[PDB]
Swiss-Prot record, chain A:
Domain YcaO span(s) in chain numbering: 49-426
PANTHER family with a match to the protein in the record: RIBOSOMAL PROTEIN S12 METHYLTHIOTRANSFERASE ACCESSORY FACTOR YCAO
Summary of subunit composition and partner proteins: Interacts with the ribosomal small subunit.
Protein name per its UniProtKB record: Ribosomal protein S12 methylthiotransferase accessory factor YcaO
GO cellular component terms, A-Z: cytosol
Disrupted-gene phenotype: Mutant shows a decrease in the ratio of methylthiolated to unmodified S12 and a decrease in transcription of a subset of genes.
Name of a matching Pfam family: YcaO
Function in brief: Involved in beta-methylthiolation of ribosomal protein S12.
A GO molecular function held by the record: ATP diphosphatase activity
Annotated NCBIfam families: YcaO-type kinase domain (TIGR00702), YcaO_for_S12 (NF040716)
């Protein structure tokens, strides 16, 4: 059966043009496996899997692969270029574009009353904020994705922009049947929602009694081995008195005084438990358990939304000491929500119903595996709605063309300095990587890979002939990036910094030092740095970039992959 | 002397003293550049030269140099027994007991030195107690030096020597004058070094036709260049005044520079010694720990930058050193001759500078060695350090502190001690072993004990947990790095418990089992015992007046005893 699911996933992938390879494999303790898998064409296009056996792990990873392919999630941080942005469809043939209105209100056919209120309580939200990153196509309008509201059965259109910023990869799954995927999606919503409550409210949870654990000897053996290897484990029921199908497992690493909390959910208690333990060690051997944090008594810090966001991103957030209290805030419950997938779905939906929460579900068949994306506003959100104002991944796209065209530019000095001011008016953090802000797959072998806003200001100051500013930002750049620069790029900045420092020396004659600089930095770096100081060529190591990004090999590879999916969408619809 | 003969003569005299010396590590990083490292096991020196044999003779020379001056022992208190024995440093020495108004006793120094070290006349005898004895009752131990102008014996406090001159102006050799010439050369090396650096002087390059008189050095230099390391070779004579060379290396990988200074009456020998010191102790992969040049001349000139330069040559250098135009013309200088001639030539320089020279000679290990002092030139630390950074300050409290482990005093006593440490102005980061002069070894808490951590222990023993938390946080912040895993785990546990004690709405028993799982039972037991005041001095064994408690220190005193033997 498993050997057959695997084979069947692998065949459907080949048939889509995807050649996948197992990269790294781990069996750190008995009954715990993880595997990493990627595109041969494309190493950044990967998933991971976990399980009680080698085969289970691989099936997990291929499952996740279809989950991420079906939701376009590999591509969610990137702009897909001018051609795709004007093609027949961008995300799905299904999608609906709502062009902007004169007073820039959110167009009439998007969302529903509940959602408008949830995302926009102050009624201060505008349509131009909602342009999806992938297209950036303001003229074409707001791309909305169809979801099915479960209370009735109505299709609701939700801006991709809102999905991408607030829900990220949460509530997504693949499965063998439509409902099976739905159940996993819903389970995951509960996993992350309950996780956040446990953490943010500093809840002391009830231990799973040893007689319950002993129904699951494979997990027990995994646990005991971890203990035996120097890692105390706490196994907790996270149901909050039987409300939710959630387990929590925590690991201590006494070597450095830290803890690491893993949360899993499934209608079957045993399976939830196994999943929680297998996720704990996913991607990690026993030498990789040293990057976590000590518990804390500062509950206010534990509760901060950013701490929860961190926990979602890498599980390296703060946990309260209270989670480990002798006495629990809830009795243990030997819960169970299992049944047929149809039963399971209804059981989980009933929970959402008693909570008075609407569920929105999109289903995808088009790669020949069932997959869903589920949104439960007030429960499935990873980032709070104000992020549509403060941390929108689309903000930054009006400037893309300007910035992509700085290499080779030749504007008047004033223009470049105004751009520094624009970047400050628009509020960009000096540490923001420019590639993330604009959605570019750069590759590692150019200056764009490591270009943050602060460095960009330095280049702009150089091109605009303001050397007081250029020095400020060049220092900033050296302080916060020499680490990651190639040796050639770091040498260039070291040279440049020295030259900018020298230019502020009112009692010193530059020609006295030129020979010494050539010996320290080499002639090319000196030539290049001096050219940058003249404003001649400030955009050191930045090649110019077209609208379809032919300049970046990485980004071309990304789009070759994406085209395979655009193909499969066209067939299916 | 011939090298084979110096080596032989040295190795024999060492065995005869009871010293088994072992060539440890050897380097020949480029042609005609050798260094060697030499051990008993923390009793060590290094040597440098153009050949393997030269390096070894250098190292053994240095070994006798350091043995004869007691320099291996300079940072350490030698215990109550030695401090009350017949003599501490040398049978020669003279003890000057303190006076009622606590003036500096009459028979020490001379008028010129009193005035130099104590211009304000603000100096007291109790400041001048040597670190090795700490014996205030016995008085100020003074060492006899010979004033060269008229040959009079002058007694100089060991305290002043140890704090201001450290290892500068010391050498050994085959003849008396050979040692003296190297000593005097060294005084010029370090004095001129400091001027070049502190005044941001641009020096004149040595022309290639002069370098070519010395093909061995040239080949060394060209290899370094070829390996990616630009070299500047400078005349440091300051227009032919001083017999000094400067060689600077760039590491373009890093953007850093490393400046080496050598001195000898023979230009060729000074040049070789400078290049050979540059790479001493270092292969070509070890040239990455230095500093970029700078335009901040005020920083370059700071005495602490010069002190750093003396300690590890990792100080700041001005970009000006590398200016196209030099502040002095190159001079093809030369002061060489017979040893006897060389000594006189160097002495004449000091005479034209109106500087007195004081020299102590030591024959007692069968090798000629000297220590030379030229106030105003050989000083490494400025005279005000006798007030501000005296290595004896901290010795009145030694007994107290050594007896804290196991102590059962009043809570009040311990807390007053925190106040004392603050009144006396000790830096929280001062390692206690340095402050008291203890060779601890690495496997105990004393190795890593800084004043801040000590305050933590004192607060714990005195039952002040608000303070104990403060200092325990401080300790974790500035030391978890170097602690053994066991010691770091203890502090992590303790910190957690102190934090818990500040929690007004939490019940400690709720967390105990979890703490035991994280920290282990011993650490929990221990940390709780420390919190009760029961046993605050975690991992600190108690220490007797002769330091039998520290194996390291016992080894140090076994070595010292060999020298004390040789002194009679
Ligand atoms: Hg790629
Ligand atoms: Hg990819
Ligand atoms: Hg020693
Ligand atoms: Hg030793």
């Amino acid at each position: 059966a498993l050997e057959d699911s695997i084979a069947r996933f692998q065949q459907k992938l080949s048939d889509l043009g995807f050649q996948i390879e197992e990269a790294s494999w781990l069996n750190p303790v008995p009954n715990v496996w993880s595997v990493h898998i990627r595109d041969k064409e494309c190493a950044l296009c990967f998933t991971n899997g976990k399980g009680a056996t080698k085969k289970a792990a691989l099936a997990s990873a291929l499952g996740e692969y279809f989950e991420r392919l079906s939701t376009n999630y590999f591509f969610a941080d990137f702009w897909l270029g001018e051609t795709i942005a004007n093609g027949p469809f961008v995300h799905y043939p299904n999608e609906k574009w709502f062009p902007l209105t004169e007073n820039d209100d959110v167009p009439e056919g998007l969302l529903d009353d509940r959602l408008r209120a949830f995302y926009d309580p102050e009624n201060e939200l505008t349509g131009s904020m909602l342009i999806d990153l992938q297209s950036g196509n303001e003229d074409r309008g707001i791309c909305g994705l169809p979801f099915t509201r479960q209370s009735d059965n109505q299709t609701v259109y939700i801006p991709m922009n809102i999905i991408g910023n607030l829900y990220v990869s949460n509530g997504m799954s693949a499965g063998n049947t439509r409902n099976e995927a739905r159940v996993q999606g819903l389970s995951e919503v509960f996993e992350r929602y309950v996780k956040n409550r446990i953490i943010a409210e500093s809840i002391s949870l009830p231990e799973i009694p040893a007689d319950v654990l002993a129904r699951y000897p494979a997990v027990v053996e995994a646990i005991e081995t971890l203990e035996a290897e120097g890692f105390p484990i706490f196994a907790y029921d996270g149901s909050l008195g039987g409300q939710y199908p959630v387990i929590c497992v925590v690991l201590f690493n006494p070597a450095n005084g830290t803890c690491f909390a893993s949360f899993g959910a499934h209608p079957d208690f045993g399976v939830a438990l196994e999943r929680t333990v297998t996720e704990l060690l996913q991607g990690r051997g026993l030498k990789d358990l040293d990057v976590f944090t000590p518990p804390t008594f500062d509950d206010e810090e534990v509760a901060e939304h950013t701490n929860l966001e961190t926990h979602f991103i890498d599980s390296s957030g703060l946990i309260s000491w209270d989670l480990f209290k002798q006495d629990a805030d809830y009795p243990f419950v030997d819960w169970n929500f299992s049944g047929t997938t149809e039963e399971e779905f209804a059981t989980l939906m009933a929970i959402f119903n008693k909570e008075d929460k609407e569920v929105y579900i999109a289903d995808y068949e088009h790669l020949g595996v069932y997959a869903c994306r589920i949104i439960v506003p007030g429960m499935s959100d990873i980032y709070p709605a104000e992020d549509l104002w403060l941390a929108n991944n689309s903000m930054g796209s009006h400037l893309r063309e300007t910035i992509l065209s700085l290499p080779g530019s030749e504007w008047e000095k004033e223009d470049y300095l105004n751009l520094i001011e624009q970047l400050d008016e628009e509020g960009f953090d000096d540490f923001t990587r420019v590639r993330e802000l604009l959605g570019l797959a750069t590759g590692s072998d150019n200056g764009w890979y490591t270009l943050r806003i602060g460095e960009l200001k330095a280049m702009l100051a150089l091109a605009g002939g303001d050397l007081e500013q250029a020095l400020v930002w060049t220092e900033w750049t050296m302080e916060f990036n020499s680490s990651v620069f190639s040796p050639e790029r770091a040498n260039y900045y070291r040279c440049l910094q020295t030259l900018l420092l020298l230019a502020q020396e009112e009692d010193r004659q530059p020609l006295q030092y030129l020979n010494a600089f050539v010996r320290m930095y080499g002639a090319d770096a000196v030539e290049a740095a001096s050219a940058a100081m003249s404003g001649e060529a400030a955009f050191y190591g930045l090649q110019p970039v077209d609208s379809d990004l032919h300049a970046f090999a990485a980004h071309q590879s990304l789009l070759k992959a994406y085209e395979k999916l655009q193909r499969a969408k066209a067939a299916f619809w």
